[PDB]
């Protein structure tokens with residue numbers, strides 16, 4: 395079976411497999427995450443498997459539908475670039491946008507801590523999704539910058555995954 399005690403109603407949602415749990419953000423009503431270890435079989439939800447809809451390993455994204463009262467964010471459109479990498483356990487860290495789909499950590503943080511929170515939606519001040527935490531440009535165990543995909547490209551990712559016909 396697979397009935398993990400999830401907790402929707404917030405902003406991010408995690409998953410679980412024989413290894414650990416990843417992080418995923420409900421943007422536009424679709425919890426986005428990386429295929430690094432989300433499982434290719436029938437994923438698990440708080441009360442039923444999660445129907446697969448969007449999933450394209452690296453250089454793309456994986457966003458399933460979040461209908462369990464999931465809070466859907468939106469595309470960024472701020473004026474500054476101060477974000478807050480939100481992890482999946484009430485732990486956000488300020489970021490400084492450094493380039494397209496990337497930001498800078500403003501505090502020596504161990505990259506190992508970043509491992510597991512992949513999907514952390516970057517949010518400028520309080521709301522407006524910017525992108526998720528795909529990876530973290532880090533030095534020996536310490537993370538210095540962020541590897542994040544904007545939440546606008548995720549919209550493009552759907553064109554790749556249709557399966558409608």
Ligand SMILES: [Zn+2]
Nearest residue numbers: 470471472518
């Ligand atoms: Zn923004």
